[PDB]
Amino acid sequence: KIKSGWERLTSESEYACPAIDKFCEDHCAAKKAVGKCDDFKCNCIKL
């Protein structure tokens, strides 16, 4: 636990630049990761 009462992040990166293409997130599904953006390319959440 964190020492503050609440722990809430409130970061727009939760919904800004979504996993819009199935040709990107089907690779993430095979590892049960989530699709992600950077300045030009599709990545998955780290394991």
Side-chain angles (χ1 to χ4, degrees):
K1 283 191 69 175
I2 191 159
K3 185 60 63 66
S4 57
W6 296 269
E7 77 195 87
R8 62 211 169 180
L9 163 67
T10 316
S11 183
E12 72 273 22
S13 308
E14 199 63 48
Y15 53 82
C17 199
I20 195 164
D21 292 327
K22 192 56 51 158
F23 297 107
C24 288
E25 79 159 312
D26 176 42
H27 291 139
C28 310
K31 314 295 168 173
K32 289 177 166 56
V34 187
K36 260 287 159 177
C37 294
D38 73 43
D39 286 309
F40 181 57
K41 305 196 71 169
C42 286
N43 309 309
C44 307
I45 288 188
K46 307 291 295 298
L47 297 174

Short mmCIF file of all heavy atoms in Angstrom, two decimals:
data_model
loop_
_atom_site.label_atom_id
_atom_site.label_comp_id
_atom_site.label_asym_id
_atom_site.label_seq_id
_atom_site.Cartn_x
_atom_site.Cartn_y
_atom_site.Cartn_z
N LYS A 1 0.83 -1.23 0.00
CA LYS A 1 0.00 0.00 0.00
C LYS A 1 0.86 1.27 0.00
O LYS A 1 1.94 1.29 0.60
CB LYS A 1 -0.97 0.05 1.20
CG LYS A 1 -2.18 -0.87 1.00
CD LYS A 1 -3.29 -0.64 2.04
CE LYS A 1 -3.98 0.72 1.86
NZ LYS A 1 -5.11 0.87 2.80
N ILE A 2 0.37 2.34 -0.62
CA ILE A 2 0.94 3.70 -0.53
C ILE A 2 0.45 4.41 0.75
O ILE A 2 -0.65 4.14 1.23
CB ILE A 2 0.68 4.50 -1.82
CG1 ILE A 2 1.50 5.81 -1.86
CG2 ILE A 2 -0.82 4.80 -2.05
CD1 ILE A 2 1.68 6.38 -3.27
N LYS A 3 1.26 5.32 1.33
CA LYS A 3 0.97 6.00 2.61
C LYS A 3 -0.21 7.00 2.56
O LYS A 3 -0.86 7.23 3.58
CB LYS A 3 2.27 6.66 3.10
CG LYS A 3 2.19 7.33 4.49
CD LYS A 3 1.83 6.38 5.65
CE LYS A 3 2.87 5.27 5.90
NZ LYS A 3 4.18 5.81 6.36
N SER A 4 -0.52 7.56 1.39
CA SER A 4 -1.74 8.35 1.17
C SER A 4 -2.99 7.48 1.32
O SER A 4 -2.93 6.26 1.11
CB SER A 4 -1.67 9.08 -0.18
OG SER A 4 -1.47 8.20 -1.27
N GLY A 5 -4.13 8.07 1.70
CA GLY A 5 -5.40 7.33 1.86
C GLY A 5 -5.84 6.68 0.55
O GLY A 5 -5.88 5.45 0.44
N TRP A 6 -6.08 7.50 -0.47
CA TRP A 6 -6.30 7.11 -1.85
C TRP A 6 -4.98 7.00 -2.64
O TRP A 6 -3.96 7.61 -2.29
CB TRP A 6 -7.26 8.14 -2.47
CG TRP A 6 -8.62 8.13 -1.84
CD1 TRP A 6 -9.65 7.37 -2.27
CD2 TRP A 6 -9.09 8.75 -0.59
NE1 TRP A 6 -10.72 7.49 -1.41
CE2 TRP A 6 -10.42 8.29 -0.34
CE3 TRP A 6 -8.52 9.60 0.38
CZ2 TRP A 6 -11.14 8.65 0.81
CZ3 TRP A 6 -9.22 9.95 1.55
CH2 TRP A 6 -10.53 9.47 1.77
N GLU A 7 -5.00 6.23 -3.72
CA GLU A 7 -3.84 5.89 -4.57
C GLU A 7 -4.02 6.29 -6.05
O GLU A 7 -3.13 6.04 -6.87
CB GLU A 7 -3.57 4.38 -4.43
CG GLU A 7 -4.55 3.52 -5.23
CD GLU A 7 -4.51 2.05 -4.79
OE1 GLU A 7 -5.23 1.65 -3.84
OE2 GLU A 7 -3.81 1.26 -5.47
N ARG A 8 -5.19 6.87 -6.39
CA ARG A 8 -5.67 7.15 -7.75
C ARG A 8 -4.74 8.06 -8.58
O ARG A 8 -4.32 9.13 -8.13
CB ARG A 8 -7.13 7.61 -7.71
CG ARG A 8 -7.34 8.91 -6.92
CD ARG A 8 -8.72 8.96 -6.25
NE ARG A 8 -8.72 10.08 -5.32
CZ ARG A 8 -9.70 10.49 -4.53
NH1 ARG A 8 -10.85 9.90 -4.44
NH2 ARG A 8 -9.55 11.54 -3.79
N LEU A 9 -4.45 7.61 -9.80
CA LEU A 9 -3.45 8.13 -10.73
C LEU A 9 -3.96 9.33 -11.55
O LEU A 9 -3.24 10.32 -11.72
CB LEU A 9 -3.01 6.89 -11.54
CG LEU A 9 -2.27 7.22 -12.83
CD1 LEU A 9 -0.91 7.87 -12.61
CD2 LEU A 9 -2.11 5.98 -13.71
N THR A 10 -5.19 9.22 -12.05
CA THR A 10 -5.91 10.22 -12.86
C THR A 10 -5.21 10.61 -14.18
O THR A 10 -5.23 11.76 -14.61
CB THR A 10 -6.30 11.43 -11.99
OG1 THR A 10 -6.81 10.97 -10.76
CG2 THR A 10 -7.41 12.31 -12.57
N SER A 11 -4.56 9.65 -14.85
CA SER A 11 -3.77 9.87 -16.08
C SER A 11 -4.56 9.58 -17.36
O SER A 11 -5.11 8.49 -17.54
CB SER A 11 -2.49 9.05 -16.05
OG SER A 11 -1.69 9.31 -17.19
N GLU A 12 -4.59 10.54 -18.29
CA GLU A 12 -5.35 10.47 -19.55
C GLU A 12 -4.89 9.35 -20.50
O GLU A 12 -5.65 8.90 -21.36
CB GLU A 12 -5.32 11.85 -20.25
CG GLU A 12 -3.98 12.30 -20.87
CD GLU A 12 -3.00 13.02 -19.92
OE1 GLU A 12 -3.08 12.87 -18.68
OE2 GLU A 12 -2.11 13.74 -20.44
N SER A 13 -3.67 8.83 -20.32
CA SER A 13 -3.11 7.70 -21.08
C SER A 13 -3.90 6.39 -20.92
O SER A 13 -3.67 5.44 -21.67
CB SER A 13 -1.65 7.48 -20.66
OG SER A 13 -0.93 8.70 -20.74
N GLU A 14 -4.86 6.34 -19.99
CA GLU A 14 -5.84 5.26 -19.84
C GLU A 14 -6.83 5.16 -21.03
O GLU A 14 -7.36 4.08 -21.28
CB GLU A 14 -6.61 5.49 -18.53
CG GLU A 14 -7.33 4.24 -18.00
CD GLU A 14 -6.35 3.12 -17.64
OE1 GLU A 14 -5.35 3.39 -16.93
OE2 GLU A 14 -6.56 1.96 -18.07
N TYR A 15 -7.05 6.26 -21.76
CA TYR A 15 -7.99 6.35 -22.89
C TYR A 15 -7.46 7.12 -24.12
O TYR A 15 -7.98 6.93 -25.22
CB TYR A 15 -9.33 6.92 -22.40
CG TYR A 15 -9.23 8.23 -21.65
CD1 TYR A 15 -9.13 9.45 -22.35
CD2 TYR A 15 -9.23 8.23 -20.24
CE1 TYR A 15 -9.02 10.66 -21.64
CE2 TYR A 15 -9.12 9.44 -19.53
CZ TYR A 15 -9.01 10.66 -20.23
OH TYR A 15 -8.89 11.83 -19.55
N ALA A 16 -6.44 7.98 -23.97
CA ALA A 16 -5.77 8.63 -25.10
C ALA A 16 -4.99 7.60 -25.95
O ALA A 16 -4.32 6.72 -25.41
CB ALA A 16 -4.85 9.73 -24.56
N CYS A 17 -5.08 7.72 -27.28
CA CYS A 17 -4.53 6.79 -28.28
C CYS A 17 -4.88 5.31 -28.00
O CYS A 17 -4.07 4.59 -27.41
CB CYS A 17 -3.02 7.06 -28.45
SG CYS A 17 -2.32 6.40 -29.99
N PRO A 18 -6.09 4.84 -28.36
CA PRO A 18 -6.54 3.47 -28.09
C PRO A 18 -5.92 2.42 -29.03
O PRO A 18 -5.36 2.74 -30.08
CB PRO A 18 -8.07 3.53 -28.23
CG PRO A 18 -8.28 4.61 -29.29
CD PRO A 18 -7.15 5.60 -29.00
N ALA A 19 -6.09 1.14 -28.68
CA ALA A 19 -5.76 -0.03 -29.49
C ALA A 19 -6.82 -0.22 -30.60
O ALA A 19 -7.71 -1.08 -30.54
CB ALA A 19 -5.60 -1.25 -28.57
N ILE A 20 -6.76 0.68 -31.58
CA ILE A 20 -7.73 0.87 -32.67
C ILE A 20 -7.72 -0.26 -33.72
O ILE A 20 -8.77 -0.56 -34.28
CB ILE A 20 -7.50 2.27 -33.28
CG1 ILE A 20 -8.69 2.70 -34.17
CG2 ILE A 20 -6.18 2.37 -34.06
CD1 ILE A 20 -8.70 4.20 -34.49
N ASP A 21 -6.58 -0.92 -33.99
CA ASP A 21 -6.45 -1.95 -35.04
C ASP A 21 -6.26 -3.38 -34.49
O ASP A 21 -5.34 -3.66 -33.72
CB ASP A 21 -5.30 -1.61 -36.00
CG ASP A 21 -5.53 -0.37 -36.88
OD1 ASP A 21 -6.68 -0.06 -37.27
OD2 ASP A 21 -4.51 0.26 -37.25
N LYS A 22 -7.06 -4.32 -34.99
CA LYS A 22 -6.94 -5.76 -34.67
C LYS A 22 -5.62 -6.36 -35.16
O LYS A 22 -5.07 -7.24 -34.50
CB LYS A 22 -8.16 -6.48 -35.27
CG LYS A 22 -8.35 -7.93 -34.81
CD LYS A 22 -8.45 -8.14 -33.29
CE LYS A 22 -9.48 -7.20 -32.63
NZ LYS A 22 -9.94 -7.73 -31.33
N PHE A 23 -5.08 -5.83 -36.25
CA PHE A 23 -3.73 -6.15 -36.76
C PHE A 23 -2.58 -5.71 -35.83
O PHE A 23 -1.44 -6.14 -36.03
CB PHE A 23 -3.58 -5.56 -38.17
CG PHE A 23 -4.54 -6.16 -39.19
CD1 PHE A 23 -5.64 -5.42 -39.66
CD2 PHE A 23 -4.34 -7.48 -39.64
CE1 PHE A 23 -6.53 -6.00 -40.59
CE2 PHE A 23 -5.23 -8.06 -40.56
CZ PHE A 23 -6.33 -7.32 -41.04
N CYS A 24 -2.86 -4.92 -34.79
CA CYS A 24 -1.92 -4.64 -33.70
C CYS A 24 -2.22 -5.49 -32.45
O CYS A 24 -1.30 -6.13 -31.92
CB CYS A 24 -1.93 -3.14 -33.39
SG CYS A 24 -1.12 -2.13 -34.67
N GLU A 25 -3.46 -5.52 -31.96
CA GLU A 25 -3.74 -6.14 -30.64
C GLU A 25 -3.96 -7.67 -30.64
O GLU A 25 -3.98 -8.26 -29.56
CB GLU A 25 -4.85 -5.38 -29.90
CG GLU A 25 -6.29 -5.70 -30.36
CD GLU A 25 -7.31 -5.34 -29.28
OE1 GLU A 25 -7.13 -5.72 -28.09
OE2 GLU A 25 -8.33 -4.69 -29.60
N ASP A 26 -4.09 -8.32 -31.80
CA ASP A 26 -4.11 -9.80 -31.91
C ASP A 26 -2.77 -10.41 -31.45
O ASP A 26 -2.75 -11.42 -30.73
CB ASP A 26 -4.46 -10.17 -33.37
CG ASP A 26 -4.43 -11.67 -33.69
OD1 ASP A 26 -4.92 -12.49 -32.87
OD2 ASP A 26 -3.91 -12.05 -34.76
N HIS A 27 -1.64 -9.76 -31.76
CA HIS A 27 -0.33 -10.13 -31.19
C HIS A 27 -0.30 -9.99 -29.66
O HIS A 27 0.26 -10.85 -28.98
CB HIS A 27 0.79 -9.27 -31.82
CG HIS A 27 1.08 -9.55 -33.27
ND1 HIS A 27 1.33 -8.56 -34.23
CD2 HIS A 27 1.23 -10.77 -33.85
CE1 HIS A 27 1.65 -9.22 -35.37
NE2 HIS A 27 1.59 -10.54 -35.17
N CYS A 28 -0.94 -8.96 -29.09
CA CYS A 28 -1.01 -8.80 -27.63
C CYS A 28 -1.93 -9.85 -26.98
O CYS A 28 -1.59 -10.39 -25.92
CB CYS A 28 -1.44 -7.38 -27.27
SG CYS A 28 -0.53 -6.03 -28.08
N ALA A 29 -3.04 -10.22 -27.63
CA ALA A 29 -3.97 -11.25 -27.16
C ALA A 29 -3.28 -12.61 -26.96
O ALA A 29 -3.48 -13.24 -25.92
CB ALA A 29 -5.13 -11.37 -28.16
N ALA A 30 -2.40 -13.00 -27.88
CA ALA A 30 -1.61 -14.24 -27.81
C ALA A 30 -0.69 -14.35 -26.57
O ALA A 30 -0.24 -15.44 -26.24
CB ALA A 30 -0.77 -14.35 -29.07
N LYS A 31 -0.40 -13.23 -25.90
CA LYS A 31 0.41 -13.15 -24.67
C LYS A 31 -0.41 -12.62 -23.48
O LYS A 31 0.16 -12.35 -22.42
CB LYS A 31 1.66 -12.29 -24.93
CG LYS A 31 2.43 -12.59 -26.24
CD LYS A 31 3.08 -13.98 -26.33
CE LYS A 31 3.51 -14.23 -27.78
NZ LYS A 31 4.30 -15.47 -27.94
N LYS A 32 -1.73 -12.42 -23.65
CA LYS A 32 -2.67 -11.78 -22.71
C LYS A 32 -2.21 -10.41 -22.18
O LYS A 32 -2.55 -10.00 -21.07
CB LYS A 32 -3.11 -12.79 -21.63
CG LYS A 32 -4.03 -13.86 -22.26
CD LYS A 32 -4.42 -14.93 -21.24
CE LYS A 32 -5.59 -15.80 -21.73
NZ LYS A 32 -5.33 -16.44 -23.04
N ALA A 33 -1.44 -9.70 -23.01
CA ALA A 33 -1.07 -8.30 -22.84
C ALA A 33 -2.10 -7.38 -23.52
O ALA A 33 -3.00 -7.85 -24.23
CB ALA A 33 0.34 -8.12 -23.42
N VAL A 34 -1.98 -6.07 -23.34
CA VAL A 34 -2.90 -5.06 -23.90
C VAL A 34 -2.15 -4.23 -24.95
O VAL A 34 -0.97 -3.95 -24.76
CB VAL A 34 -3.50 -4.17 -22.80
CG1 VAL A 34 -4.58 -3.21 -23.32
CG2 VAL A 34 -4.12 -4.99 -21.66
N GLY A 35 -2.81 -3.85 -26.05
CA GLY A 35 -2.21 -3.00 -27.09
C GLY A 35 -1.94 -1.57 -26.61
O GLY A 35 -2.71 -1.03 -25.82
N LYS A 36 -0.85 -0.97 -27.09
CA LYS A 36 -0.37 0.37 -26.71
C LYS A 36 0.19 1.18 -27.88
O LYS A 36 0.71 0.62 -28.84
CB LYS A 36 0.68 0.26 -25.59
CG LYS A 36 0.06 0.56 -24.21
CD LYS A 36 -0.23 2.06 -24.07
CE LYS A 36 -1.29 2.31 -22.99
NZ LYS A 36 -1.53 3.76 -22.80
N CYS A 37 0.11 2.50 -27.75
CA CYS A 37 0.73 3.46 -28.65
C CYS A 37 2.08 4.02 -28.17
O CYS A 37 2.35 4.14 -26.97
CB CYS A 37 -0.20 4.68 -28.81
SG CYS A 37 -1.79 4.46 -29.62
N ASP A 38 2.87 4.45 -29.14
CA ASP A 38 4.01 5.36 -29.03
C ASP A 38 3.87 6.42 -30.15
O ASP A 38 2.83 6.47 -30.82
CB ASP A 38 5.36 4.63 -28.97
CG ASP A 38 5.87 4.00 -30.26
OD1 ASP A 38 5.80 4.60 -31.36
OD2 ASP A 38 6.53 2.94 -30.14
N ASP A 39 4.86 7.29 -30.37
CA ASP A 39 4.77 8.36 -31.38
C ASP A 39 4.49 7.90 -32.83
O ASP A 39 4.01 8.72 -33.63
CB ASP A 39 6.04 9.22 -31.34
CG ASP A 39 6.06 10.13 -30.11
OD1 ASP A 39 5.06 10.85 -29.88
OD2 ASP A 39 7.10 10.17 -29.40
N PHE A 40 4.72 6.63 -33.18
CA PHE A 40 4.48 6.11 -34.53
C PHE A 40 3.98 4.66 -34.60
O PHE A 40 3.25 4.32 -35.55
CB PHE A 40 5.79 6.29 -35.34
CG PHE A 40 5.74 5.83 -36.79
CD1 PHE A 40 4.79 6.37 -37.67
CD2 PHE A 40 6.66 4.87 -37.26
CE1 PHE A 40 4.73 5.93 -39.01
CE2 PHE A 40 6.62 4.45 -38.60
CZ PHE A 40 5.65 4.97 -39.47
N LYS A 41 4.32 3.80 -33.63
CA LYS A 41 4.11 2.33 -33.68
C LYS A 41 3.20 1.77 -32.59
O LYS A 41 2.92 2.42 -31.58
CB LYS A 41 5.47 1.61 -33.72
CG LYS A 41 6.37 2.09 -34.87
CD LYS A 41 7.55 1.16 -35.18
CE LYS A 41 7.07 -0.14 -35.82
NZ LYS A 41 8.19 -0.95 -36.37
N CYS A 42 2.69 0.56 -32.85
CA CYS A 42 1.93 -0.30 -31.95
C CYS A 42 2.86 -1.16 -31.08
O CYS A 42 3.66 -1.92 -31.63
CB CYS A 42 1.07 -1.23 -32.82
SG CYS A 42 -0.37 -0.53 -33.65
N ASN A 43 2.72 -1.15 -29.75
CA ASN A 43 3.42 -2.04 -28.81
C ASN A 43 2.40 -2.81 -27.94
O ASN A 43 1.20 -2.58 -28.07
CB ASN A 43 4.37 -1.18 -27.95
CG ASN A 43 5.27 -0.28 -28.78
OD1 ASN A 43 5.93 -0.70 -29.72
ND2 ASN A 43 5.31 0.99 -28.48
N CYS A 44 2.85 -3.70 -27.06
CA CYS A 44 2.00 -4.31 -26.02
C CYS A 44 2.52 -3.95 -24.62
O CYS A 44 3.71 -3.66 -24.44
CB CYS A 44 1.93 -5.83 -26.20
SG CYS A 44 1.44 -6.47 -27.82
N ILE A 45 1.66 -4.01 -23.60
CA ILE A 45 2.05 -3.87 -22.18
C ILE A 45 3.12 -4.91 -21.80
O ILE A 45 3.01 -6.09 -22.16
CB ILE A 45 0.81 -3.89 -21.26
CG1 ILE A 45 0.04 -2.56 -21.44
CG2 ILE A 45 1.17 -4.13 -19.78
CD1 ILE A 45 -1.11 -2.31 -20.46
N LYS A 46 4.16 -4.47 -21.07
CA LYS A 46 5.31 -5.28 -20.63
C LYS A 46 4.91 -6.42 -19.68
O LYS A 46 3.95 -6.29 -18.91
CB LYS A 46 6.35 -4.38 -19.92
CG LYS A 46 6.83 -3.13 -20.69
CD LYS A 46 7.71 -3.47 -21.90
CE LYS A 46 9.04 -4.13 -21.56
NZ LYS A 46 9.93 -3.27 -20.73
N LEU A 47 5.69 -7.51 -19.68
CA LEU A 47 5.50 -8.71 -18.85
C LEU A 47 6.70 -8.96 -17.92
O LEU A 47 6.57 -8.63 -16.72
CB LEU A 47 5.15 -9.91 -19.77
CG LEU A 47 3.84 -9.78 -20.57
CD1 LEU A 47 3.70 -10.96 -21.53
CD2 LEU A 47 2.61 -9.77 -19.66
#
